[PDB]
Amino acid sequence: ESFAIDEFMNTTDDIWVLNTTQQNPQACKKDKKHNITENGIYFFRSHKENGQIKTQTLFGEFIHFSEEEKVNNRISISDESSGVHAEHLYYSSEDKKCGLVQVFAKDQNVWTELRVRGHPNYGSLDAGCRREYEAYVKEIKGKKNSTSPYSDDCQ
């Protein structure tokens, strides 16, 4: 099954990074969708350094490794501040409120982010998303560094 990244991000809600296997990730990481076209998605990527919010306008272009691919499950990003050049959504819940994104950066760092619509709460995360992220972090070859970039002090 393929999971469309333009449907998962087609919301006016903030998409927060709940969990990530990136080592030493930024704080209060989130995306805000600005526009979705047939060629890609314009959004605003933010994080918090020492109380201040840094934001950048990004355009993720839908890319396909063949001509038979039409599901928009992968985006290429240019001029990303952390060197992230590609993102691939490999799982998302049916209500599109949580997803697992494999992130490829230019420094050859590859990690996984568990993203959620709206700010993370202490309730019950979708069981499918949870078991999928558990399976991934269990499948990491040595030293799984899973942290949460979100805090209740993030606005």
Residue numbers in the entry: 48 to 59, 59a, 60 to 152, 156 to 172, 174 to 191, 191a, 191b, 192 to 203
Wording from the paper:
Functional and structural characterisation reveals that members of the CirpA family directly bind to properdin, inhibiting its ability to promote complement activation, and leading to potent inhibition of the complement response in a species specific manner. Whilst many molecules act to control inappropriate activation, Properdin is the only known positive regulator of the human complement system. All CirpA structures share a lipocalin fold with a short N-terminal α-helix followed by an eight-stranded beta-barrel and a longer C-terminal α-helix.
Another CirpA1 residue undergoing a conformational rearrangement upon properdin binding is Y122 which forms a hydrophobic pocket around properdin P377 together with CirpA1 residues F122, Y131, and F150. This pocket is incomplete in all three CirpA1 homolog structures. However, it is likely that the homologues have evolved to target properdin from other species, especially given the identification of multiple CirpA homologues in a single tick species.
